[PDB]
Amino acid sequence: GAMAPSYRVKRMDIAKNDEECVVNAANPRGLPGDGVCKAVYKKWPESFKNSATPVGTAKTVMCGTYPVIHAVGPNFSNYTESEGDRELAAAYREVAKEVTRLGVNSVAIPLLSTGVYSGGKDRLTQSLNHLFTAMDSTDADVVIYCRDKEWEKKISEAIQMRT
Ligand SMILES: c1cc(-c2ccc3c(c2)OCO3)n[nH]1
Ligand SMILES: c1cc(-c2ccc3c(c2)OCO3)n[nH]1
Ligand SMILES: [Cl-]
Ligand SMILES: [Cl-]
């Protein structure tokens, strides 16, 4: 575990992370995808061997010895708000199981279902709160990666508010 487990947020490509493993915002079919998923495909293509996994689950595949945790958030275009909320919470619980199993001291994580699976809604708070619900009981240092300047500020505020 980390000596003083923390949350941090950085505004940069998660493919450039400085953590011991990465979470991919994966699609269920293990396809290269878009956004975070395509960045992860470019950096760790070997990790897409048999990475297909259902919505609400995570499946880890090693790129060398570097673990890629493929976490499949729901696409809110297809799910009801209620069912999507349940699957988004479930994906993050499976990420916490994998991070724990791997024994890493740090993990790079995107906000699941906030991009093209958002169904056109701002889900920063919904996705971040499910991240915290899952990761709070882990002792890994968590580094959240985002692209938007305003999201960075809002994620940073939410982290600092609970310290
Ligand atoms: C294509 C674009 C990017 C990207 C991701 C996050 C960023 C960023 C660029 O500039 C500010 O924060 N990664 N692949
Ligand atoms: C649309 C979204 C992105 C993207 C790629 C990598 C990222 C990211 C966003 O947020 C952190 O790591 N590229 N084009
Ligand atoms: Cl997404
Ligand atoms: Cl973002």
From Swiss-Prot:
It is found in: Host cytoplasmic vesicle membrane. Signal peptide: none annotated. ADP-D-ribose binds at residues 13, 27, 35, 115-117. It comes from the Viruses. Residues 4-163 form the Macro domain. It is a peripheral membrane protein. Changing residue 36 to A: Partial loss of mono-ADP-ribosylhydrolase activity. Phosphorylated by host on serines and threonines. Disulfide bonds: none annotated. Interacts with mRNA-capping enzyme nsP1. Interacts (via C-terminus) with host G3BP1; this interaction inhibits the formation of host stress granules on viral mRNAs and the nsp3-G3BP1 complexes bind viral RNAs and probably orchestrate the assembly of viral replication complexes. Interacts (via C-terminus) with host G3BP2; this interaction inhibits the formation of host stress granules on viral mRNAs and the nsp3-G3BP2 complexes bind viral RNAs and probably orchestrate the assembly of viral replication complexes. Interacts (via C-terminus) with host NAP1L1. In the N-terminus, the macro domain displays a mono-ADP-ribosylhydrolase activity. The central part called, the alphavirus unique domain (AUD) has a zinc-binding function. The C-terminus region, also called hypervariable domain (HVD), is mainly disordered and binds several host proteins. This intrinsically disordered domain contains 2 SH3 domain-binding sites and 2 FGDF motifs necessary and sufficient for the formation of nsP3/G3BP complexes. This is Non-structural protein 3. It comes from Chikungunya virus (strain S27-African prototype).
